[PDB]
Design an enzyme around this catalytic site. Sequence first.
Site, PDB file in Angstrom:
ATOM      1  N   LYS A  90      -2.755 -19.541   2.293  1.00  0.00           N
ATOM      2  CA  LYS A  90      -3.794 -19.011   3.164  1.00  0.00           C
ATOM      3  C   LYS A  90      -4.890 -18.380   2.325  1.00  0.00           C
ATOM      4  CE  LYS A  90       0.068 -17.028   5.748  1.00  0.00           C
ATOM      5  NZ  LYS A  90       0.444 -16.602   7.139  1.00  0.00           N
ATOM      6  N   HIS A 105       0.852  -1.182   0.000  1.00  0.00           N
ATOM      7  CA  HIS A 105       0.000   0.000   0.000  1.00  0.00           C
ATOM      8  C   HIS A 105       0.890   1.235   0.000  1.00  0.00           C
TER       9      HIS A 105
END
Length: 548
Positions: free
Chosen positions: A378, A119
């Site tokens: 995951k 980000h």
Amino acid sequence: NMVKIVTVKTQAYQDQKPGTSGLRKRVKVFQSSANYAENFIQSIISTVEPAQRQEATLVVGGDGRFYMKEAIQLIARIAAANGIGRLVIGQNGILSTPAVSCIIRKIKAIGGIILTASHNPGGDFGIKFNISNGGPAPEAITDKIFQISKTIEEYAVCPDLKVDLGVLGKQQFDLENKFKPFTVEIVDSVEAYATMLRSIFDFSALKELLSGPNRLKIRIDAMHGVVGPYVKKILCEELGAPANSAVNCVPLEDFTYAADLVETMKSGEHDFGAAFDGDGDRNMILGKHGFFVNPSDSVAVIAANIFSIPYFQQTGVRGFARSMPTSGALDRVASATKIALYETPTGWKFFGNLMDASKLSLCGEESFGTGSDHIREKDVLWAVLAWLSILATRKQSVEDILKDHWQKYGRNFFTRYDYEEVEAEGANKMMKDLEALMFDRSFVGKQFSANDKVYTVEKADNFEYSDPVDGSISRNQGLRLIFTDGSRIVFRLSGAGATIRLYIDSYEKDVAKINQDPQVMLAPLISIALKVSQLQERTGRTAPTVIT
């Protein structure tokens, strides 16, 4: 139209060792080091022996963010010149990591490349290689990638080759001096993944849970990462939750906390909330009014309700597993079954190896939550659907499911203290000292009291693990103080400065104390952990950086 292949001379860099996570360097060093990306991509592809490159295909997949589409074009320009027969790329370059793992195993591909970014990359950029099993390449092969990258003198590229990543279907490329055409399959970013999820869960039951006047109201904040389009497609368009259920589900190319969800859940409209971070790793699950579900508790709640999910109902539970710092809640449900439980070092790669040996079905990590053998990675969205399957069959609130679970199994209170950017000299002093403490003769059985709660040491070691599948041995995985009442203190260091992780797991069987603030119930063991460790004197820190 014949595309040229050219060989490009290059200087070798010396710090492209990948590890469990891929290569992750600052974006500035990618822009300011010539051929950094190409050496590495070439080094990855060079692990594929050349006679197996035409019948091989790589799945390449991206984060959404800035730079991704160029790095996808480069991978294509290099994989073609090396004679890789086929790339599969998600439309616009979008392919989440569960999606890449999924597709790799469905189409029996040689592996995959996963691009990632931070980000605000004004900020870093990752390139991770997965293998035929759909999981991250293991140490054996990351060491070969580093070895190659350190002595690479040249790479191959099709400098003229361009791929329209936003147009579905097959495109073909005729390379000069090659007979078979180079193929690129652009695939729907969500399709394969949602077909898998449709085979694992009961989409009929979930559609009835999220539509209707008696429906269950959910808010899922994907925090502008890659899972966004998977949430909108699977949870809204397919399962029927109102459009306003999924939030921030478009990945943003540029620009950290979870408090938007906590505030809206405190209002009281929604029955179930979930927030993800940009990476799709760390994540949160809230109940009505903001009720917090501890990641270590989800693993256990899911395990104890595991047959509410058609996949396990039809496949079996071949095994349970838990990372060593993860709380012992899972242990208590496993111990009521004849399913074995494995305690692995921190790392999803360790779950993968038991999955590959047909010995692990459900696993959990305190810093993420619950996974399964459906892939080798995951999956936050999987974990959210697992919780919604369970709400649907229990027909109870999240809070009442946790309360009845603790009532049956007892409660493992659990917190983790992170101390970040600590003076590294003092950190290693603190644990070397703490180790010698616990290796002493009279240490086992010593007693600690705080506020008329007595803890006595049952076992104190520095966790070691022999992988039963790859044969390797992993030492110094963290120091565990285990007490007779079933409570634990665990200490770990981690690699930018140093970082201390302190995990505290106190077991309460008394029902008058099940429903208590975890920070209060844990206060006695916290005090013990900080006296013994002498953590303030070796670090100067008087509080953790984060409490979780």
